[PDB]
Amino acid sequence: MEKTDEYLLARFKGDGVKYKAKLIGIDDVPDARGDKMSQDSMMKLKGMAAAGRSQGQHKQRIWVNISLSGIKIIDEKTGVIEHEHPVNKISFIARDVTDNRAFGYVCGGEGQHQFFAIKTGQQAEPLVVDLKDLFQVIYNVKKKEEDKKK
């Protein structure tokens, strides 16, 4: 129907939503945004993951957890939280037009950007959408609160 702020809040509250996936790789990037920049990284990383696969090396199996806390990359085997990126540290979400089961995002403070390339167990789109809605909700709430303080 309509994903209202309330629905979205209830969805990303606490543990939020969780997706099965694999970590294609991590790459240092020059800027916070950019389709081309993101594509170049994804391509380089997939190139590397491929070379690894031809030698019996597979991508780390993970859980991409999406919530108000941002993104948590969790190891599927140990349950160890490998990475955690607060919403205010994720600057760009990159769609991978060459793959229906891959996407990436840039995170880090200014001047220290990293591209996390992800291979989704299922389709990537529903995941990219969630992230979009998440950023959207966080945004709406903050905006209201502001108009209230004023």
């Binding site: 389709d35 993101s38 919403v87 205010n88 769609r95 950023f135 959207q136 966080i138």
Partner: peptide, 9 residues
Amino acid sequence: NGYENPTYK
């Protein structure tokens, strides 16, 4: 395609 986070930084 790709998109940025309004609340980044």
